[PDB]
């Protein structure tokens, strides 16, 4: 049923055409890798999700690509236990939707909930709760994959095969393909947050107030970060932070139902943007992140610089902003502990989303932001990424290696392919 599609990822940057596979049949699956396989490998497979990373890992040009998104069942939910079991085309806004009147919330959200499962576990995703939850691989208790031999293999985060369940966490579709998986949730009693709002001056204040121990006192924490303009007005930032609210913590009105789903302006923004033990919902607490694919001639850079190296972080922005490149929409926050998977992008640090229009130099820029990051011991992520060279990604990864090992014990054939692995050589 395979039929010719020309593919990009969000960003609609470096198209190659792919035979896509779209079946709710799993065994049809099974048997599309295992004719790859009698191929001998030729150009590959690879899964794709919902489309949501920007970059080239979700694509295959000349080769097979498998969308996964029919696979959408949900097999259980159970309170007492916390786990649900799903297939890996089901979508988190999906997940958040049946799972709530279970009081259960999905342990890790990103800016956007049309994400699949499969690709939130492959891109080992990480949300506003990072540096109290860590990411979503952290919440994987067992995940059923497709590999290159036909088998699909029961994988635990310990005991037998633990490599290879922490090589496909944050493994971008390389060690095959996720068809099932059991995540354990979040227990909550409503579906509301309670927020503070603070506003920083600076960029000085912005690090002081992430590094004053407040953050200890928020499960949640995330920033809109001013990158435009000159110091010390440079990395001014709206901040906002919370947890989720008990039933009593909600107004009467809303007690019935707990689990339901210019300079002027800026005056304004600075005032209203101070509150604290605010009842919000899921889209009030993270907007405006609700207002295809997105908008052609923007390039998304995302990077993370170990806490430690302050700094150097400080540097970085003050170049960003001295660059004649200019983001309006930022995003900023303090990541916690890593996990263990070794392509794994969260480390503990300084984390930030910036947003470029595509303009004469910024490729250039990029690749000399990307080797002050690699200096100062920092790393890009993959989800966002489609330029950046197989030298400088191997540095950023120090623990590389010992994925590709774990990748040529479980595909030695190359029968999972695409376009970001051809070229970051991770193939
Ligand atoms: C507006 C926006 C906001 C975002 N915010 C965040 C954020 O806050 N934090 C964050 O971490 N990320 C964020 N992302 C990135 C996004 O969460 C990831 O790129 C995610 O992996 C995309 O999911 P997908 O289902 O679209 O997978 P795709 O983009 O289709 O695929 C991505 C990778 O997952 C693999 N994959 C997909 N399904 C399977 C499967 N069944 N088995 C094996 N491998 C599979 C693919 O091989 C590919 O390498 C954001 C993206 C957008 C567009
Ligand atoms: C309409 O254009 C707005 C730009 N959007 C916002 C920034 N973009 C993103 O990919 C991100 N969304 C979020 C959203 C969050 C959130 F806080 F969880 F919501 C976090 C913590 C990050 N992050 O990397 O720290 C990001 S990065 C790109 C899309």
């Known amino acids: 049923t395979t039929t010719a599609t020309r593919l990009t990822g969000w ?40 489309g949501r990373s920007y970059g080239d890992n979700a694509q295959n040009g000349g080769g097979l690509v498998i969308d996964m998104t029919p696979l959408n069942t949900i097999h259980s939910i159970d309170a007492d236990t916390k786990l649900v079991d799903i297939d890996a085309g089901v979508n988190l806004d999906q997940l958040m939707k049946a799972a709530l009147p279970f009081g259960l919330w999905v342990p890790v959200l990103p800016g956007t909930r049309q994400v699949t499962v499969g690709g939130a576990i492959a891109c080992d995703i990480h949300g506003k709760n990072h540096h109290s939850a860590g990411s979503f691989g952290n919440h994987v208790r067992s995940m059923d994959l497709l590999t290159a031999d036909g088998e699909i293999r029961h994988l635990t985060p310990t005991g037998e095969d633990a490599e290879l369940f922490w090589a496909t966490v944050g493994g971008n579709g390389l060690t095959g393909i996720i068809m099932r998986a059991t995540i354990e949730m979040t227990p909550t009693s409503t579906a509301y947050f309670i927020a503070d709002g603070d506003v920083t001056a600076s960029l000085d204040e912005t690090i002081a107030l992430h590094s004053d121990g407040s953050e200890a006192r928020y499960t949640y924490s995330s920033a809109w970060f001013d990158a435009i303009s000159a110091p010390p007005k440079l990395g001014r930032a709206a901040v906002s932070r919370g947890r989720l609210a008990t039933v009593e913590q909600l107004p009467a009105k809303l007690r019935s139902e707990p689990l339901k789903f210019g300079p002027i302006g800026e005056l304004w923004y600075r005032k209203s943007g101070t509150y604290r033990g605010k009842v919000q919902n899921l889209t009030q ?50 990541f916690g502990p890593r996990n263990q998977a070794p392509l794994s992008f969260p480390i503990p640090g300084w984390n930030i989303c910036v947003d470029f229009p595509i303009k004469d130099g910024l490729g250039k820029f990029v690749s000399e932001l990307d080797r002050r990051v690699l200096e100062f011991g920092g790393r890009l992520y993959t989800a966002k990424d489609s330029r950046t060279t197989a030298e400088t990604f191997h540095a950023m990864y120090p623990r590389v290696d010992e994925w590709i090992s774990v990748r040529r014990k479980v595909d030695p054939l190359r029968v999972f392919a695409s376009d970001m692995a051809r070229r970051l050589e991770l193939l």
Request: proline content about 6%.
């Open 285 to 334: 607490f993270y907007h405006p992140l609700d207002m295809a694919y997105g908008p052609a001639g923007f390039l998304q850079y995302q990077f993370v610089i170990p806490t430690e190296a302050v700094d150097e972080f400080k540097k970085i922005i003050g170049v960003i902003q001295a660059s004649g490149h200019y983001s309006f929409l930022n995003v900023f926050k303090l």
């Open 11 to 50: 960003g609609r940057t470096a198209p190659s055409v792919a035979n896509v596979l779209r079946t709710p049949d799993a065994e049809m699956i099974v048997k599309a890798v295992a004719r790859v396989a009698e191929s001998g490998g030729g150009r590959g497979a690879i899964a794709r999700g919902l």
